[PDB]
Amino acid sequence: YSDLSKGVLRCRTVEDVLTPLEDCFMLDASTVLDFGVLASIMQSGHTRIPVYEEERSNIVDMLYLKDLAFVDPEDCTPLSTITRFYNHPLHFVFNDTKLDAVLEEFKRGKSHLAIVQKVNNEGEGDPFYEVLGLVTLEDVIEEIIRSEILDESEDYRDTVVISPQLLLATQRFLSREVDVFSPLRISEKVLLHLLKHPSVNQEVRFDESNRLATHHYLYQRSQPVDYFILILQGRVEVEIGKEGLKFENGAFTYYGVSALTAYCPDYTVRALSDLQLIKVTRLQYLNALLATRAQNL
Amino acid sequence: CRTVEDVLTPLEDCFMLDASTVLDFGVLASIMQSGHTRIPVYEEERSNIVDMLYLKDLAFVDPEDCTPLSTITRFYNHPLHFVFNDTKLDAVLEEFKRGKSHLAIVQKVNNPFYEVLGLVTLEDVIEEIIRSEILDESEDYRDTVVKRKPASLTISPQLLLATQRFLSREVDVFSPLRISEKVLLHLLKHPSVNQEVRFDESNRLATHHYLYQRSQPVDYFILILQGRVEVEIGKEGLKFENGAFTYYGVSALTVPSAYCPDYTVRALSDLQLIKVTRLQYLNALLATRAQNL
């Protein structure tokens, strides 16, 4: 009987949990559903997305994620033609209405998201309803759990402390093929500068006597790592997976991208010859991003 | 939505700290990354919880002090909250409220002994209660129903699991955050995904030997399981030979912060590979999002 959990929230209104309209995830009905939009929508984590038409506050329809099933980007179908196809309801709620009412509203007409409205009597003539955000069940549950019995543990945030031409080719390859080096994150100028930096361009001397010298290992499996490596010239032996599948890789095969976005690889890379490579630590990546966001503005 | 047992989380999946644990730098970083306001402290075995550690008590500890958790816990002495598995949700909510504890440790009988099942947090109970009685009709899937007119228009499981793990751990677009391990494995098990290519030895440059042609649109990802290929990179045409576990066309699946490669891949042998179209990726994203978690 959740009627008990309903007795300790009758003093809270929507204002407490309201997420303001400016901070709400929405879609302009005129959006075109290409791969980018579809991927970003399906990854946003929302199953229910409002759709407005002109101003951000003129919500008209609602998009369920399943509405997008069987939708091909090639068709470049607009979101309007998907929402004007289905007939999903818009659940409304008032600025001042209590939370038990909001919950029995989510129940009646199954939903987890309601358009919070407030009346505007300031003005001669008839009044109007001014949308001022959304109320989502996540926030209501959070408020109930925080205000039923509160713990003074708001301390979450406790903090505890090679040929220049081939390098240009590498810059172009990375900008066009690897995402973390996309021009949107690191300008092509800054990336070119990074790849030609001495602390990035590295070489390895292969002691043939100690054929398995510790310095021949660019990556060691299940061992913390902090850098990205692309092989410019030479050959390496890669041992992949728990099984230890051994392959031989050469130039233009990059490793450890997840180290820039702890991270421990799923493989071990060892040097088989004299190597020319480019190593990029996470800190170097952060400084490149900072420089790029300073350059843009 | 009946008893504690139905919503608790098991000892296996819980985060705790040993009582003799030194509070070095690593433990502090680990806890702060876990983001848990409560950490149990077991005496000898995890099944035996002896103390409770509130995050409030652990904020201002100096990593350089290398204090032992014993000092913190014994200084704050936070009482414990036990409970059985048969107790309903309303009873445990009243227990949490009248008591001053945010979580309890559940006890069932494996008979004769009281085995600790796990920890029930108030978050879990409130979640279950004010979630199980309000559904969202957008999380159910009735898309089998055809609403618009219908137009009339394999290999070793061991290395396959290895491929799934490799992609999940190394390539981002296949990260578990985007495609669940189940859905990714299911995708790798598929005729149009697991593909082979036959190398016409007479016409070494057959149009079908070209998986990617530089500056020519493509819309799919390829990882090489078996065979050899020639990669011609850049306007310069740097030619290299690549083999197994060298993936291509990742940018066709990523969404930035209309894809043409910076290279041309040609087949040199009979190829066994994994092909992933943009539509296949989008349907994988939906499929993973169908499973609530």
Side-chain angles (χ1 to χ4, degrees), chain A residues 2 4-7 9 11-21 23-53 56-107 109-117 119-151 153-161 163-202 204 206 208-209 212-219 221-222 224-234 236-241 244-246 249-265 267-292 294-297, chain B residues 3-16 18-42 45-63 66-73 75-87 89-99 101-107 109 112-141 143-147 150-152 154-157 159-164 166-168 170-181 183-195 197 199-203 205-271 273-291:
Chain A
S2 74
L4 280 60
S5 196
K6 192 203 300 180
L9 51 71
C11 57
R12 303 265 183 258
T13 57
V14 180
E15 286 173 87
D16 294 314
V17 308
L18 173 66
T19 175
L21 182 71
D23 295 319
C24 282
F25 183 99
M26 297 187 166
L27 300 171
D28 191 322
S30 55
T31 303
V32 174
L33 297 173
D34 67 353
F35 175 93
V37 181
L38 293 172
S40 291
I41 286 173
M42 299 187 307
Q43 295 192 37
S44 77
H46 293 87
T47 67
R48 209 187 191 97
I49 298 152
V51 169
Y52 61 98
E53 195 141 51
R56 185 178 180 75
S57 50
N58 192 323
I59 305 169
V60 57
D61 267 354
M62 193 68 64
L63 179 75
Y64 301 171
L65 251 177
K66 64 199 219 186
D67 300 354
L68 268 42
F70 288 104
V71 177
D72 186 327
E74 303 287 346
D75 306 8
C76 281
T77 42
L79 186 64
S80 68
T81 55
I82 309 300
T83 65
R84 296 187 308 191
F85 189 99
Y86 292 62
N87 187 320
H88 297 328
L90 275 61
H91 304 268
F92 287 90
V93 158
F94 281 113
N95 163 46
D96 59 0
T97 197
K98 304 294 176 182
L99 287 185
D100 58 332
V102 168
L103 263 68
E104 70 187 0
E105 177 61 14
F106 290 168
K107 173 157 68 64
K110 301 139 269 279
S111 179
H112 281 357
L113 182 147
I115 296 94
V116 184
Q117 298 192 164
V119 199
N120 183 277
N121 301 279
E122 283 66 3
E124 308 299 308
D126 293 296
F128 53 94
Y129 304 77
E130 46 182 36
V131 180
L132 52 83
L134 306 171
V135 52
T136 179
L137 178 69
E138 325 308 348
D139 301 348
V140 191
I141 300 176
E142 187 177 359
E143 178 65 41
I144 292 169
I145 61 179
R146 184 170 73 263
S147 61
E148 266 285 11
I149 317 93
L150 56 86
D151 64 335
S153 299
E154 304 134 345
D155 305 358
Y156 300 107
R157 323 198 172 286
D158 297 356
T159 69
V160 198
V161 172
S163 171
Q165 201 138 348
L166 182 141
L167 298 183
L168 193 156
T170 295
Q171 169 271 316
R172 292 173 171 179
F173 166 77
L174 289 177
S175 291
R176 197 185 303 185
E177 219 69 15
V178 188
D179 189 308
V180 302
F181 300 106
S182 173
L184 276 61
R185 292 182 169 79
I186 301 169
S187 68
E188 301 184 63
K189 176 190 298 183
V190 174
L191 181 57
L192 185 66
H193 183 64
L194 181 64
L195 300 194
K196 292 189 188 175
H197 197 285
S199 299
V200 175
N201 295 276
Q202 291 201 350
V204 179
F206 190 54
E208 302 223 30
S209 66
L212 295 176
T214 56
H215 77 276
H216 302 161
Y217 284 61
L218 307 176
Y219 292 94
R221 176 182 180 88
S222 290
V225 68
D226 185 23
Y227 45 91
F228 168 88
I229 293 179
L230 183 154
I231 297 176
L232 303 177
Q233 290 184 1
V236 296
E237 182 178 66
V238 303
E239 312 187 1
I240 303 175
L245 296 167
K246 285 174 63 184
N249 286 119
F252 280 75
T253 63
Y254 47 96
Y255 302 94
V257 188
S258 306
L260 302 178
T261 58
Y263 161 67
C264 293
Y267 51 75
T268 176
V269 180
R270 190 180 62 83
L272 302 181
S273 308
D274 293 326
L275 296 169
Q276 293 184 81
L277 57 87
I278 62 104
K279 189 155 63 181
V280 182
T281 73
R282 190 194 311 275
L283 177 60
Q284 297 174 30
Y285 186 81
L286 298 179
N287 292 319
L289 290 189
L290 279 178
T292 303
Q295 171 183 329
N296 281 282
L297 189 66
Chain B
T3 65
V4 181
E5 195 160 18
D6 300 327
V7 72
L8 74 87
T9 182
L11 288 155
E12 292 182 351
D13 305 325
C14 286
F15 178 77
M16 304 177 173
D18 176 74
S20 298
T21 312
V22 301
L23 268 160
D24 62 358
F25 178 33
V27 173
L28 298 153
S30 175
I31 295 180
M32 300 310 161
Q33 294 207 67
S34 77
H36 287 150
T37 65
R38 304 293 162 90
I39 295 90
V41 175
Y42 53 78
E45 304 291 350
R46 293 179 57 88
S47 297
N48 170 248
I49 291 168
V50 62
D51 263 328
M52 200 74 254
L53 186 67
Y54 294 11
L55 184 64
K56 185 180 190 174
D57 303 324
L58 192 66
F60 315 113
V61 299
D62 201 76
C66 282
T67 179
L69 176 143
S70 304
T71 50
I72 304 290
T73 48
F75 181 71
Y76 285 101
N77 188 322
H78 282 290
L80 275 143
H81 190 185
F82 291 83
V83 73
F84 310 140
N85 61 337
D86 66 318
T87 187
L89 296 174
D90 69 337
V92 162
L93 185 61
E94 180 64 4
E95 218 165 13
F96 285 145
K97 283 164 65 177
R98 299 291 285 180
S101 300
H102 264 63
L103 70 90
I105 48 191
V106 187
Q107 261 159 334
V109 290
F113 55 96
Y114 264 118
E115 60 168 325
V116 183
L117 287 178
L119 300 103
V120 53
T121 72
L122 175 140
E123 179 184 326
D124 295 3
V125 178
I126 296 289
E127 209 82 62
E128 177 56 21
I129 298 168
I130 56 173
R131 184 89 71 168
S132 65
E133 191 152 340
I134 45 178
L135 312 179
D136 190 311
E137 58 182 10
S138 73
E139 297 176 357
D140 188 305
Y141 284 82
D143 49 8
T144 301
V145 179
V146 291
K147 294 292 193 185
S152 201
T154 306
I155 310 306
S156 171
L159 70 69
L160 185 139
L161 193 155
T163 294
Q164 169 271 317
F166 169 78
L167 287 175
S168 292
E170 281 296 314
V171 188
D172 189 307
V173 301
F174 301 109
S175 173
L177 276 60
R178 290 182 168 79
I179 301 169
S180 68
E181 303 260 320
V183 174
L184 180 58
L185 185 66
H186 186 203
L187 183 64
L188 300 194
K189 295 187 189 175
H190 199 286
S192 59
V193 173
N194 202 313
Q195 291 201 351
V197 179
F199 186 53
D200 181 318
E201 197 67 18
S202 66
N203 194 10
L205 294 76
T207 56
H208 77 277
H209 302 162
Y210 285 103
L211 307 176
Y212 296 96
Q213 293 198 27
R214 180 181 183 283
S215 289
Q216 198 164 346
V218 305
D219 67 354
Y220 48 91
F221 169 89
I222 291 180
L223 185 154
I224 298 300
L225 302 176
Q226 178 211 354
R228 300 283 290 179
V229 297
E230 182 178 64
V231 188
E232 200 165 10
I233 303 175
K235 302 161 57 182
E236 336 185 328
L238 295 167
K239 286 173 63 184
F240 308 105
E241 196 169 356
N242 285 119
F245 279 75
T246 63
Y247 45 84
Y248 301 93
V250 189
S251 306
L253 303 178
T254 57
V255 56
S257 178
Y259 160 67
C260 294
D262 185 60
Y263 49 74
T264 293
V265 179
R266 191 180 63 83
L268 302 181
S269 172
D270 294 325
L271 296 168
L273 57 86
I274 292 169
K275 189 156 173 172
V276 182
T277 306
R278 274 184 169 175
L279 275 75
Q280 298 174 29
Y281 187 80
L282 299 179
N283 291 320
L285 292 188
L286 275 180
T288 181
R289 209 150 315 287
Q291 299 134 51

